[PDB]
Paper text:
It is a pore-forming toxin (PFT), which is secreted by the bacterium as a water-soluble protein, binds receptors on their target cell membrane and, following proteolytic activation, forms circular heptameric oligomers that insert into the plasma membrane thus permeabilizing it, potentially leading to cell death.
To verify that the quasipore conformation is indeed representative of the full pore conformation, we analysed the structure of wild-type [name] heptamers. If performed at sufficiently low [name] concentration, it allowed us to reduce aggregation and to obtain relatively well-dispersed individual pores in detergent micelles. This resolution was sufficient to fit the quasipore model by rigid-body docking, demonstrating that it very closely corresponds the wild-type final pore density map. Most interestingly, the nine amino acids at the tip of each β-hairpins adopt a different conformation than in anthrax protective antigen and fold sideways in a rivet-like fashion, confirming our previous experimental conclusions. Similarly, to other transmembrane β-barrels, including the lysenin pore13, the position of two rings of aromatic residues spaced by 32 Å delineate the edge of the transmembrane regions (highlighted in Fig. 4a). The extended inner β-barrel of the pore is 87 Å long, spanning the entire length of the protein.
Author numbering:
A (entry chain C), B (entry chain D): 2 to 424
C (entry chain B): 266 to 318
């Protein structure tokens, strides 16, 4: 049962090994401590363990061995959750894609103030005068050409320096998924149509008894192929020549030549073909003559689309962290800028919520982001939870719209009147 | 809730921050203003905001900061729609394709006057004497060889200059789609027919008990293939030669040669094949002998076609805008001519109605057309709506016609009499 | 000469056939697309253990 770093600090009142009246500190959790020992322990500082052993701070190489000292047994006795307080989805007023996206990007309470605050906790640098932990006095929120948030340059002041830098938040290339029945596409319209091909046929059934269906099967297949090959060839030739020459016609210059040829080659390539292959088969239980018509065509298609509520959010932040100026531990301080991943949408290795959980459990997997735990030393990591919740929660609002694409193949089958036949 | 530029101008009577008695102006909408600040604000002019802040006109770089001033809080309190007044479809007298298209192109009330007026609002240049905002005194409406609208050259006068230019409106390459049951194709006629192939067969079932069906499956496949390849070859050869020569027949000129060959190539290509593959299978539960005949043929097909109401309209205008001479803002004034897209039919990025909506919401997406909002400064954008409606509304009239195409494959299956068989 | 080689092709081949016993006009739409998919997964009890010392 892994112990979270939050409460892990020293219990001042406690004695430890001599009888704390709490649940024992053990070896299993003790080994798990090594990566954040600096948070908990002073260089020389010593801490105990229930099996009659002790831990030492960063000053020493120390293995887990015998000693006497206090520590937290208290926290392990009653662990606390660590969870996000509320997952609830946000409801924003509905509209069209332009406006809905804007409202989301515009929202001070729902987007900006919380995103900025989260940024503040996470390491982002500050700019100029301040009002609270988020968006400063001079700071402002305007739109980038891309639709992202941006501010004016003139005032400057990042980290209290005259440089031009400003924080920006990207709008995502939105992607959505919808579990419910709540959305729909309307009737199609063909802007333009060209007719590629037609095929017609019929079944003639004069006789009374034998009645059977007819099958027309088509295939329209077009394909492209691409390949490249590289060949290496080596030629070895040894030759000898004599000048005796044979009187009739040996040849004055008589040469014999042997050539050995070796060549090898490797290649790769591939092709893709698309086929439109319709099959029509009328059962036609009637004594008749039945025309059938099968059509292939190309067209421009457009559909109006009914409003859909859900949207997924992809966020990566700006590169301000390098300016950040906070106690790092995991990373060295470096000038060159690095964009930090915020992924809200579910990508397991990328997503922030998981990383938050992972930091609590402690897992040594591969990582490329600044960790969550250093906030505990710096800010305490309390009462922040709602702020994180603001960023993490799903947001939805109905956006009505269009469905359109490049011109596509389409097809059709028409059936005629089964004309009465007689013998 | 984005605020439209229409009403956005200053409220003269209002004080602003000191207590307007209206709903507050806020930062979110304020940032959205930057692209049309020039319309609303004078260079030095100042405007307020509810969170104790102020905005400044184009003279300044100004960020959103503290100040005191009036603005519109009034409009935001009660927003107005911005919509097209009526979507209703136009009914034009029915006919054939030649006449129906003509009537549409001919209609003064429904086509010309409104299209010209819309053009006038949008930036199109004027020619000679005028009568109202649309089609001038000298101006006229005649037909181009293409079927487009055109006028005579002699009089001239575009922008009050002697040049030859005249406005023209294109007839679209019509494309239509039809949701309803309301249309049909009649009986087919074969103008010409050539018989490609025939295959015949039968099932003989003398014995009383075993009765089973027969399946004939065919495939006629023809295909074409095209490809091109490019190969690059590099040859490196080093050679040495000696003149010692070997007495018997070394060769006076003794050479040894080594050649290294390297070659590589890439290619692309593709092929398409069409197959006509019919399958016929009579169940034939009878003790009999049953002939079956399967035919492949080629033919010219023609169908009369029942009237269809709907038509979609594709419009792009003339290139007159460059002559236009109005306050641009978004575009610089340039002499070279550019054709401006009017798309009535639904193509999302192209269509005018969407662009009208987009201009109202404010979206920074990529754009290649003159924007809708400058009309507000120039004309006020009032009472225009019906005119826009005239252009935008769907129009329909039944056009009867023909369905024809190039010669096509067709096929047929005939079944014989199941002749009574006996053991 | 001697040679070896091979190729792999993947095909997505859907077939749709409405029975449609009605006197009508019936539109059908078939779509191909590419996407990123993710599923939450319910707890599973068993695990197999591979050990080499």
């Amino acid at each position: 049962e892994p112990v979270y770093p939050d409460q892990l600090r020293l219990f001042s009142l406690g004695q430890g090994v001599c009888g704390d009246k709490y649940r024992p500190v053990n070896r299993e959790e003790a080994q798990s401590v090594k990566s954040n020992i600096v948070g908990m322990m002073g260089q020389w500082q010593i801490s105990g363990l229930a099996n009659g052993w002790v831990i030492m701070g960063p000053g020493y190489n120390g293995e887990i061995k015998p000693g006497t000292a206090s520590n937290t047994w208290c926290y392990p006795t009653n662990p606390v959750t660590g969870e996000i307080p509320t997952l609830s989805a946000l409801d924003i007023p509905d509209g069209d894609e332009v406006d809905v996206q804007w409202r989301l990007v515009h929202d001070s309470a729902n987007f900006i103030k919380p995103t900025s605050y989260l940024a503040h906790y996470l390491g982002y640098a500050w700019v100029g005068g301040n009002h609270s932990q988020y968006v400063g006095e001079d700071m402002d929120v305007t739109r980038d050409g891309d639709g992202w948030v941006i501010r004016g340059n003139n005032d400057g002041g990042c980290d209290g320096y005259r440089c031009g830098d400003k924080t920006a938040i990207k709008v995502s290339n939105f992607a959505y998924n919808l579990d419910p029945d709540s959305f729909k596409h309307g009737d199609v319209t063909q802007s333009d149509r060209q007719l590629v091909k037609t095929v017609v046929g019929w079944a003639v059934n004069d006789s009374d008894t034998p009645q059977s269906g007819y099958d027309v099967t088509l295939r329209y297949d077009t394909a492209t192929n691409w390949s490249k090959t590289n060949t290496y060839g080596l030629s070895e030739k040894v030759t000898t020549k004599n000048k005796f020459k044979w009187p009739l016609v040996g040849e004055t210059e008589l040469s014999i030549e042997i050539a050995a040829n070796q060549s090898w080659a490797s290649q790769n390539g591939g092709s893709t073909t698309t086929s439109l292959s319709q099959s029509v088969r009328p059962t036609v239980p009637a004594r008749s003559k039945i025309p059938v018509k099968i059509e292939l065509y190309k067209a421009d298609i457009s559909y109006p689309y009914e409003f859909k509520a859900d949207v997924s959010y992809d966020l990566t932040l700006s590169g301000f962290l390098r300016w950040g100026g906070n106690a790092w531990y995991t990373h060295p301080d470096n000038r060159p800028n690095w964009n930090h991943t915020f992924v809200i949408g579910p990508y397991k290795d990328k997503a922030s919520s998981i990383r938050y959980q992972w930091d609590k459990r402690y897992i040594p997997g591969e990582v490329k982001w600044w960790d969550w735990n250093w906030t505990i030393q710096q800010n305490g990591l309390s009462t922040m939870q709602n702020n994180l919740a603001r960023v993490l929660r799903p947001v939805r609002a109905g956006i009505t719209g269009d469905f359109s694409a490049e011109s596509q193949f389409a097809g059709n089958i028409e059936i005629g009147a089964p004309v009465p036949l007689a013998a």
